[PDB]
Amino acid sequence: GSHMCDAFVGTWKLVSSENFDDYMKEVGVGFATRKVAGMAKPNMIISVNGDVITIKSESTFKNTEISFILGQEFDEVTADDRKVKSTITLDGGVLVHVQKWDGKSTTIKRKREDDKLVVECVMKGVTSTRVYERA
Numbered sequence: 001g002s003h004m005c006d007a008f009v010g011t012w013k014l015v016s017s018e019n020f021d022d023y024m025k026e027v028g029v030g031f032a033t034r035k036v037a038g039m040a041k042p043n044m045i046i047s048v049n050g051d052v053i054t055i056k057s058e059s060t061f062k063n064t065e066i067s068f069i070l071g072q073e074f075d076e077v078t079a080d081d082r083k084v085k086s087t088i089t090l091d092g093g094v095l096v097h098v099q100k101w102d103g104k105s106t107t108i109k110r111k112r113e114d115d116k117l118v119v120e121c122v123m124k125g126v127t128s129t130r131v132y133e134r135a
């Protein structure tokens with residue numbers, strides 16, 4: 001077993017969002033993508049197999065999947081079609097995901113809080129909070 005498995009593994013559904021449109025604006029997502037992505041109610045599937053973590057997002061907008069080893073940079077094509085260099089670490093029980101592209105950076109933190117999995121996305125000074133519960 002691991003901390004990761006106990007905390008995060010499973011299937012999660014989006015229950016609330018705050019400031020997601022504003023976050024996407026800051027990131028540079030265009031109007032039509034923001035509108036359609038903002039309507040999505042994704043299920044997010046986290047699994048662990050050895051050192052490899054997989055995060056899969058299924059929605060009516062886009063289905064995405066990343067697999068990675070903590071601390072090891074990888075190339076990620078985001079749902080909004082940015083080509084980014086990503087590194088994900090586990091810091092004090094929080095999954096911290098940094099994406100770098102075009103001289104820009106954004107950080108996505110995923111943590112447990114009570115029965116929720118809380119996703120905080122930060123771009124410059126703008127934060128969006130997305131709350132998931134077990135499916």
Ligand SMILES: O=c1cc(CCl)[nH]c2nc(-c3ccccc3)nn12
Nearest residue numbers: 012044046055108117119121130132
């Ligand atoms: O709703 C979002 C938005 C972003 C980045 Cl824009 N990333 C993200 N990751 C997740 C998520 C939620 C639950 C489990 C795994 C991942 N939700 N989520």
